[PDB]
Amino acid sequence: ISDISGSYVVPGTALQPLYQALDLPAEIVARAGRLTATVKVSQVDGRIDCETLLGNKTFRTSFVDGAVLETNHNLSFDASQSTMAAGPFSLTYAASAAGLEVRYVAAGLDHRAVFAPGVSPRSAPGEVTAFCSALYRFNREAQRLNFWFHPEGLLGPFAPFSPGHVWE
Numbered sequence: 001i002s003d004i005s006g007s008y009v010v011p012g013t014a015l016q017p018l019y020q021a022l023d024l025p026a027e028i029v030a031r032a033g034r035l036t037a038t039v040k041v042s043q044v045d046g047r048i049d050c051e052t053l054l055g056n057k058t059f060r061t062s063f064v065d066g067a068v069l070e071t072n073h074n075l076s077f078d079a080s081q082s083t084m085a086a087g088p089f090s091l092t093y094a095a096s097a098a099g100l101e102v103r104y105v106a107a108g109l110d111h112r113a114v115f116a117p118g119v120s121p122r123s124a125p126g127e128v129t130a131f132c133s134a135l136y137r138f139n140r141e142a143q144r145l146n147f148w149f150h151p152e153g154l155l156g157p158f159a160p161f162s163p164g165h166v167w168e
C-alpha cells in the first residue's frame, strides 16, 4: 500500500482526457490510445524509478523532487503526500489490490485512472515507432511558437511528466 513498487499495465485508452488537455493533435491522441505499456515502478526513499516497456523500446526515468523537465521547468515531488506537480498539471497516486490509481488535475481536467498490476500485451513495434516519430515532429513543430513530451511520458502512470534527457 505505502510502497507502490510493482509492474503495472498502462493502456493509452485510460489517459485520453489527459492527452486532450495537453493540446495534442488528433493523430497523437489516437495513436497513444491504441498503445499499451508495462511500467515497472520502484519506489525508494524519496525517489521513483520507472522502466517502461513499449513495443520494442525500453525507457527509463527517475522521479525526484526538483528534477528538470524539458520544454518546447522543474518537477515538484512530495512522496509523503504522494503528489507530483509541474506547470499547470498535478497528480496524486495510491496503490491497492486493484492496482495503481492516479488522479490528474489541471485547469479543465479532473481525470482518474487505475492501472492493473501485471504485464501488458506487446504493442506492435511499427505502431510504437510511428508514434515516437509523430511525437517528435509535434515537439519540433511546436517550437516555432508546453512540455517536450516523451513517449514514456504519455504512456505512463505519472503522465505527462518525463524527466531526464531525450536519451537514455
Ligand SMILES: O=N[O-]
Pocket (backbone or CB within 6 Å): 027, 030, 031
Ligand atoms: O490514428 N493514427 O494515425
Ligand SMILES: [Zn+2]
Pocket (backbone or CB within 6 Å): 059, 060, 061, 150, 151, 152, 153, 162, 163, 164, 165, 166, 167
Ligand atoms: Zn524519455
